[PDB]
Amino acid sequence: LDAQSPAADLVRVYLNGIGKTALLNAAGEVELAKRIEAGLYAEHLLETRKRLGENRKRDLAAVVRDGEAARRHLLEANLRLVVSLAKRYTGRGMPLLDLIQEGNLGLIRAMEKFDYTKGFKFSTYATWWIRQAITRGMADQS
């Protein structure tokens, strides 16, 4: 066939891609981040006590895999928030895609260098970091 078809909006593709997100209500995020911490500690100990041949030789690798999986979801957790904050700062000439991408970069730079430290909802911290990142993007765009 050779019939033509209409194009698709880029934003709608983003919404379809993130529709699978399901926020954890800020409650379970602490254990979510305890999975990352233990994963990194597994990283270190895997290459520190190397000689040990044991059934545990696979459990820590599973903890590292759990840490890799725990981040893949934590990042999904905040895309609604980042898109909202980005949309809050539109109308300055930039396509919403460029701002939301910049906020995505800011988020990934944040949470991966964040600790609960008996801190408050990480959502406030993410909002702050992504807001700073998008503000910097707009400023450098001029």
Partner: peptide
């Protein structure tokens, strides 16, 4: 120059 305005508009007591 930027933090003053940013604090004034958003991010108060954080």
């Amino acid at each position: 120059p930027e933090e003053r305005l940013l604090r004034a508009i958003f991010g108060e007591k954080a």
